[PDB]
Swiss-Prot record:
Function: Cell-surface receptor that plays a role in cell-cell interactions, cell adhesion and migration, helping them to sense and respond to changes in the tissue microenvironment. Participates thereby in a wide variety of cellular functions including the activation, recirculation and homing of T-lymphocytes, hematopoiesis, inflammation and response to bacterial infection.
SS bond list: 9-110, 34-99, 58-78
Included stretch of the parent chain: 20 to 169 of 742
Record's protein name: CD44 antigen
Tissue expression summary: Detected in fibroblasts and urine (at protein level). Detected in placenta (at protein level). Isoform 10 (epithelial isoform) is expressed by cells of epithelium and highly expressed by carcinomas. Expression is repressed in neuroblastoma cells.
Glycosylation sites: 6, 38, 81, 91, 101
Location relative to the cell: Cell membrane; Cell projection, Microvillus; Secreted
Record note on domains: The lectin-like LINK domain is responsible for hyaluronan binding.
Residues at which hyaluronan binds: 22, 59-60, 86
Lineage summary: Eukaryota, Metazoa, Chordata, Craniata, Vertebrata
Natural source organism: Homo sapiens
PTM annotation: Proteolytically cleaved in the extracellular matrix by specific proteinases (possibly MMPs) in several cell lines and tumors. N-glycosylated.
Residue ranges of domain Link in the record: 13-101
SUBUNIT field: Interacts with PKN2. Interacts with TIAM1 and TIAM2. Interacts with HA, as well as other glycosaminoglycans, collagen, laminin, and fibronectin via its N-terminal segment. Interacts with UNC119. Interacts with PDPN (via extracellular domain); this interaction is required for PDPN-mediated directional migration and regulation of lamellipodia extension/stabilization during cell spreading and migration. Interacts with RDX, EZR and MSN. Interacts with EGFR. Interacts with CD74; this complex is essential for the MIF-induced signaling cascade that results in B cell survival.
Length: 150
């Protein structure tokens, strides 16, 4: 089995993670993923701080208690053309996730993340892709909810 993670640079600690090139993360797996990154699910306040230094996406992702898209520029294809930290109502579905790392600089940090630093040993080939396109490959596991694994 194989898991691919595309990660974003950090903006005031905040970054975006996409699993397997599509919406495939539940809230439980989101919490697991952030923990595997020595990080937490962002608060609304943390998202607003990242937004202010240029953090925006066009993908829904879990934060603490919500599912959101941060938007600086209106695009009709993204978050209903809205701007700001847009909160999706109907969030039973699967999405991406956001994560907040407390030890990151209060700026943009594009330092390559070489691996999943707080995963455990396991059978999954886990790949991390940073913005330069390099694939960092390891074997491990990070999921802890049997409803995610099954």
């Amino acid at each position: 089995a194989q898991i691919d993670l595309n990660i974003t640079c950090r903006f005031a600690g905040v970054f975006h993670v996409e699993k397997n090139g599509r919406y495939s993360i539940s809230r439980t797996e989101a919490a697991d993923l952030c923990k595997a990154f020595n990080s937490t699910l962002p608060t609304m306040a943390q998202m607003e701080k990242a937004l202010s230094i240029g953090f925006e996406t066009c993908r829904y992702g879990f934060i603490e208690g919500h599912v959101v898209i941060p938007r600086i520029h209106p695009n009709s294809i993204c978050a209903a053309n809205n701007t700001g930290v847009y909160i999706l109502t109907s969030n039973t579905s699967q999405y991406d996730t956001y994560c907040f790392n407390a030890s990151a600089p209060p700026e943009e940090d594009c330092t390559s993340v070489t691996d999943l630093p707080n995963a455990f040993d396991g059978p999954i080939t886990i790949t991390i892709v940073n913005r330069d396109g390099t694939r960092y490959v390891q074997k491990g596991e990070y999921r802890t909810n049997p409803e995610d694994i099954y």
